[PDB]
Design a protein around this motif. Sequence first.
Motif, PDB file in Angstrom:
ATOM      1  N   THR A  89      34.474  39.361  25.368  1.00 39.32           N
ATOM      2  CA  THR A  89      35.092  38.299  26.149  1.00 39.32           C
ATOM      3  C   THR A  89      34.322  37.006  25.908  1.00 39.32           C
TER       4      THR A  89
ATOM      5  N   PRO B 165      30.737  45.173  26.600  1.00 40.58           N
ATOM      6  CA  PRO B 165      30.760  46.416  27.383  1.00 40.58           C
ATOM      7  C   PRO B 165      31.436  47.552  26.635  1.00 40.58           C
TER       8      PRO B 165
ATOM      9  N   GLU C 195      43.408  44.239  31.126  1.00 40.35           N
ATOM     10  CA  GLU C 195      42.819  45.386  31.805  1.00 40.35           C
ATOM     11  C   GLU C 195      43.782  46.569  31.798  1.00 40.35           C
TER      12      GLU C 195
ATOM     13  N   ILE D  36      37.033  35.406  39.888  1.00 39.60           N
ATOM     14  CA  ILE D  36      36.751  35.346  38.451  1.00 39.60           C
ATOM     15  C   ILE D  36      36.988  33.935  37.919  1.00 39.60           C
TER      16      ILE D  36
ATOM     17  N   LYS E  14      43.870  48.583  28.834  1.00 42.72           N
ATOM     18  CA  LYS E  14      42.651  49.382  28.754  1.00 42.72           C
ATOM     19  C   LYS E  14      42.777  50.642  29.608  1.00 42.72           C
ATOM     20  N   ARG E  15      43.691  50.633  30.583  1.00 45.04           N
ATOM     21  CA  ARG E  15      44.000  51.857  31.311  1.00 45.04           C
ATOM     22  C   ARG E  15      44.962  52.755  30.545  1.00 45.04           C
TER      23      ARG E  15
ATOM     24  N   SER F 142      40.922  43.353  38.808  1.00 39.39           N
ATOM     25  CA  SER F 142      40.092  43.122  37.629  1.00 39.39           C
ATOM     26  C   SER F 142      38.892  42.274  38.046  1.00 39.39           C
TER      27      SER F 142
ATOM     28  N   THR G 138      37.305  47.611  36.600  1.00 41.12           N
ATOM     29  CA  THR G 138      38.460  47.907  37.442  1.00 41.12           C
ATOM     30  C   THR G 138      37.971  48.317  38.827  1.00 41.12           C
TER      31      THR G 138
ATOM     32  N   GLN H 195      35.168  45.585  23.677  1.00 45.47           N
ATOM     33  CA  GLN H 195      35.855  44.330  23.949  1.00 45.47           C
ATOM     34  C   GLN H 195      34.852  43.198  24.151  1.00 45.47           C
TER      35      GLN H 195
ATOM     36  N   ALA I  69      30.576  38.422  29.152  1.00 39.02           N
ATOM     37  CA  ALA I  69      31.383  38.841  30.290  1.00 39.02           C
ATOM     38  C   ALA I  69      31.719  40.323  30.195  1.00 39.02           C
ATOM     39  N   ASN I  70      31.677  41.004  31.339  1.00 39.81           N
ATOM     40  CA  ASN I  70      31.985  42.425  31.445  1.00 39.81           C
ATOM     41  C   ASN I  70      33.180  42.592  32.374  1.00 39.81           C
ATOM     42  N   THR I  71      34.214  43.289  31.905  1.00 37.79           N
ATOM     43  CA  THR I  71      35.429  43.490  32.691  1.00 37.79           C
ATOM     44  C   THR I  71      35.420  44.896  33.283  1.00 37.79           C
TER      45      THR I  71
ATOM     46  N   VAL J 274      42.768  38.282  32.275  1.00 39.23           N
ATOM     47  CA  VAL J 274      41.831  39.329  32.665  1.00 39.23           C
ATOM     48  C   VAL J 274      42.595  40.525  33.226  1.00 39.23           C
ATOM     49  N   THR J 275      43.739  40.277  33.867  1.00 41.77           N
ATOM     50  CA  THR J 275      44.478  41.345  34.532  1.00 41.77           C
ATOM     51  C   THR J 275      45.228  42.230  33.541  1.00 41.77           C
TER      52      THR J 275
END
Lengths: 131, 236, 147, 129, 774
Positions: free
Chosen positions: D83, D127, D70, A70, D73-74, A120, A96, D81, A92-94, D66-67
């Motif tokens: 970015t 997204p 995330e 990333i 979001k869980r 991620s 899991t 969101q 940008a699309n995040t 980014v981590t």
Amino acid sequence: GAVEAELDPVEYTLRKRLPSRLPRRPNDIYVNMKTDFKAQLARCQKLLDGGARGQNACSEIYIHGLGLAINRAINIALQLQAGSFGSLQVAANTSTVELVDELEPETDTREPLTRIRNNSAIHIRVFRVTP
Amino acid sequence: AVFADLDLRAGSDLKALRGLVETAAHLGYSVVAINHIVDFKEKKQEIEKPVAVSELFTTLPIVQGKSRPIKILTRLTIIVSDPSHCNVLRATSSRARLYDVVAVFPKTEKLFHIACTHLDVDLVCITVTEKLPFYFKRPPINVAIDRGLAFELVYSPAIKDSTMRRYTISSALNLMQICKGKNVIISSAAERPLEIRGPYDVANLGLLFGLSESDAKAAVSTNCRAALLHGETRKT
Amino acid sequence: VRFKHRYLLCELVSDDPRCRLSLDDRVLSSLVRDTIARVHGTFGAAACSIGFAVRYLNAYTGIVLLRCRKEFYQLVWSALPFITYLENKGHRYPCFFNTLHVGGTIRTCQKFLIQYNRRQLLILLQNCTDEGEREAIQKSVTRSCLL
Amino acid sequence: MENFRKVRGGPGSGPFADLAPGAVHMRVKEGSKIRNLMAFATASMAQPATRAIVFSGCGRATTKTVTCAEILKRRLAGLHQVTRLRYRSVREVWQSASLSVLKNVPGLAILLSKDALDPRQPGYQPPNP
Amino acid sequence: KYITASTFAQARAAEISAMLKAVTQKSSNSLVFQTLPRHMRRRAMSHNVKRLPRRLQEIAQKEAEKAARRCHMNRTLEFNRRQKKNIWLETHIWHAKRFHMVKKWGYCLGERPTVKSHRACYRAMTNRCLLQDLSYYCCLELKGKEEEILKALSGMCNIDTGLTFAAVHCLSGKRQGSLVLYRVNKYPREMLGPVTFIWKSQRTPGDPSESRQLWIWLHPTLKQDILEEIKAACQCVGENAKPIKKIIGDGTRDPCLPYSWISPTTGIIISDLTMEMNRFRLIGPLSHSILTEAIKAASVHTVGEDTEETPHRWWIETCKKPDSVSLHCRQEAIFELLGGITSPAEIPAGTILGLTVGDPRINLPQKKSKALPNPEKCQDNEKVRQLLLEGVPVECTHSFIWNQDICKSVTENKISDQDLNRMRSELLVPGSQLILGPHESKIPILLIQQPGKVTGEDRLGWGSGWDVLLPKGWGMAFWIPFIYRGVRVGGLKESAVHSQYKRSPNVPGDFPDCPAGMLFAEEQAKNLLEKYKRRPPAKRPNYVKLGTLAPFCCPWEQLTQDWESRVQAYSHLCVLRSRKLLKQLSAWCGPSSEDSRGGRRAPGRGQQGLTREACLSILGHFPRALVWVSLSLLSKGSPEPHTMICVPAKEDFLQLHEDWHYCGPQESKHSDPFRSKILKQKEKKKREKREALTLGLWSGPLPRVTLHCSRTLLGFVTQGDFSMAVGCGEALGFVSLTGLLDMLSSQPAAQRGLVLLRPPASLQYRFARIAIEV
RNA sequence: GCCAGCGAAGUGAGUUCAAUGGCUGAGGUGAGGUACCCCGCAGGGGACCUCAUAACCCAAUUCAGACUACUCUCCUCCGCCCAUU
RNA sequence: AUAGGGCGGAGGGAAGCUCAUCAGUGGGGCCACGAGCUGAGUGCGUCCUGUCACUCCACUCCCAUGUCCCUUGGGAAGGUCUGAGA
């Protein structure tokens, strides 16, 4: 058993079965690790300008990236936006991604173990929007 | 292997300067170096703020190729005929430390001998206009190529006359046959607003001068970076 | 049973678009032959009477694609910078500049022309900042995406 | 070892500053700050505030923002969101002789919201998981 | 309007060029027969018009308007008469129809494709689908009581150094084992060979009371080697008829072979079977998707409820139990769940899954090379995660066609395929799928997958493939639907690039051992000697003047003697395939850097530390060591086969540390006095007319390999080639550790793996990096 | 004797208004000369310089086989003529 | 007997010099993951509070858009020959 002597392979991380279709009408770019930065940026510049030579026709690209990919993906994207000199849209699309690791020592009594991890991933999406 | 590095002799006004910078950026150039002709008759030294490129141009020249920012250098071409004027240039080695590349123009063979022997210069200007014959001794050329002296050949007879074309091509063939062709770069002067040629055309024009089928382009693309490095080591 | 042809692209760079409108095949052929006859003799110019010929010409664009032989393209491409003083109905000063030398192969020469045209469109956009040309740019991009 | 960082969320920060959210910055490399920011996210889930969470990151921390964002979001299960990806200039002075160097780093901003983006998205396309 | 008319002109020129080149590339000299793609060109269109498609035949008839004996025998009897000598597999005629078939150590097999597809095979190996034909793997089926077969495998196993296969019992129920077996337990380092091993325990006993099966799968020369080992170890006791078995086996079926004997004393039943069942290796990510879409599980509902007239009563006897219906339903559900998985790349190690499959010629799509991806519906993420985490097919591992009598009743069906081709045309359906089912082929097949480069950490699971295991009767019938879907076929060259791209040695003979490697090296040396005597002088360079004893791949037997003499002064083929010491060697040869303490990272989660006495103590227990090494060229290099690996000097280190982009120094020339000897031999020969040595063979292998070159050579390369997996030269070669320990002790400083190499045709040295990733 | 095609990516060179054997230097081989070096069977081996390394012809989907056009080049069966014991 | 010298003809699934640098045309290749997903260590806070700071501890340094690599018309590539790729 996982401390003394064990085999630790990393198997795979699911992306989708999309990249069997993604190099046909759009363009997809995967950033690997420790290979080369300048080769990746040169392939981005070559695939971006491709009209009836690259795949079919350049209309839209998006770049995949994992945990450090990333960072190399945002680096090649923010240098390509300075290099291509045109007004292009970057979104940008995040997501899991589930990572599975296997470990097993060589012993006739031990059993293999699977560790779960979450990563991620980013999808950097470049549109050719009018200037 | 840094391409698109040549020298220009062009200052009249700001409008023609902007036009030549835009023409060089559009066609084939990524480093523009402006020479300033100073003869032995005037003997003037104005070094502090004569040109002022960055305060007058608009923030970037953009090229049609790789789209990289152009580095702009300010060089000085000093026409030296008298030996006392060469002593004046010897006096300027510690007084004013600017003008990164110092370019002497010799006319006397003894002065060209002490230029390649003792005088600290970067690139010796060799142009022949209106019947200037000149011989060459081989051990000072050998010390020059061992040192790093790149020989400049500034050419623009293509619009004015044909006899000047004859004298320039004769001097170029004599230089290629005597000097053996180790480090010689050719460049163009710009008095008229259209006195520039193609970027890849420099290779075939040095091929018309000779030196190889390829070592014209190889020698300019290596020796311009080598001359910039030599001027940087002279400055530092 | 064939001969390996070579081709060359040259851009006429000048202002005053009467110079852009003043192009013809016979006039350009006689101009190139006359300016080679000044530079080269019979051996240089007469090889251009059989090998060299006009192939592709655009008036407004100013890109000229020309042919040349295997043993003579070095002479032709060395004779190209010496094309000076085109005298015509007005007092003009046109001048050629080489883009890239393509070794024959017309198809990738037309491929490289499209990328060069796209670079000539996209770079000129940000420095001008005018909507009247930008609308035609958007129409050209739309028509290129329809292709 | 003195650094100055200039950011070139420029038009987007207006409607957020109309509602005053909680700002999050991740400088370079820090471990317990992730737990602290997750604790503040868990607290602000219960504290009375509008649905607007802002994350910012520069340098190597453009992976870390980014981590951790995330992970929320869980847990929070956000909907929309944005970015944003912009240039940031880092002028730093260090010593080997004191020398200054100006680097260009990416800067990544994450905007979590639900209702502020519902009249939005003709252009940006965030997204919607 | 200057810039506006310029914009319109540039847009018109771009449109003209973009349309012109696109029309001109599809025009192809205004010829309809050249408009077709180059993979789909047939040159027989001028003789008969049917070689073109119908829409193109309607144009080819107008273009034609503009423009040896028969077989007089039974072809089956001629094929049987020719099959009396060779093997002639069921798909061997399909291969010989469009591939190069060369006779080898065993049977005649496919070397190279007829069409140039060397880049296309790699491009189909990365993303697309590709399959192989693997029928040489002979199988030893061993039967016996639970306590005796463990002793028979403990006499052969060597668990203490090798990988665990027998006594582990947890890896056995889910998946297989793949490793190298050994000889009798004297532990002499003499005999070694790769063998793929299969356990299966039934779910119902759960105790040492029933008959336990086990399978050995191996190579034919390895079959000849290890069959004597098993025999010495365990116990010393008018219609057309298609020859499905081998005629060597069919002729030996009355006297000796296949070897199916028993033992009264120890209760070990040995079944050596050369050709009983076949295996096909389908490599590719899209291969999994088209195997989901093509291979379909047979319906247990309609046959199981009321459909029963005439034989295949065994499916009724199996379906009589209610557990078999739910078992087949779970097998079909897990097969569709595997189809939901996007790749065969995420799977732990070689899993096994078998189920009942309705044969894939039921559908038979009308088009050819019709490759499509999956639909965008990719739901059910929870069951995919459950299958990826655990992956336990204990219940679905069903052994139905492994039996003695049921699989023969499957093979006894004798199905035709041309008649089945005609039955589809008699139905006259345009594009639908209709197969009548009073009697269907409801047979089970097995799927054993393969992950590749699991040991190597450079790619982490590169080669994802499947293995369709099927009986000998159902052969080429299951081959051709994949070919119609569009799967490409690669030969032994595709296995060679599968070896060298995954940085594994080839299992027939490229690794050195006593019975197999030496004979394969001599067989390759005969071909290279034939090409050497075939080429006249003044074409090839002499190896006396510039090089050394190359490319004959057996000089290391006296090289290791000089190394052990140099060690001891100041057992053969001992290969250190022990993964702990290989990880210890990876700890030195892999990282070459110094920041604070260790290579490439300071914490590392490892144990860094230098001890030279502990390294020298390894050579005391392990004499004559030989380890394979993946070597990587940095820049400016193209490796050939048989390149010799040379130790760098300190001057090379200084010149490489001084400037980047530095090429290796040249090799000095050597004295060549043998030329006058060969001229004297020729003069003696022409004297006597009125030891054959031409240009660099002589009987002096001892004093030269000690000290000939200016540098120290220690390494020999079998597969030297550039891989497209990296984008540079990537070679794989065998070295000795006695020369590597001197290299590691010589440099505690900066880069240590940078070791030169010399190709035999050149005099140039090119540096590369050593890696041991096992 | 008759009967069987696939419009979708991209040939260890794949072009089609038709690209790819370019220069330099040392070694290979056929030869000549030696005021160089080492070893002692008159000699042998390595070292230095120069010449010759051509012709037939050119790929458009591949392969197998056959054909025709070859001579720097290598393994043999030979013939004629000249000279010697 | 000396195949010593000259020439011609026949047969071999006979082969049709290599390497390195500079340079020209075209083509191919250049593999989503630093066991940093609730990471670790240090100083004030704190023992249940970090819009605190530091260490490129994982060097990924450099205006990054290629100073990256490979190879590139044979025995015959020529015949308006044969056959195969259904």
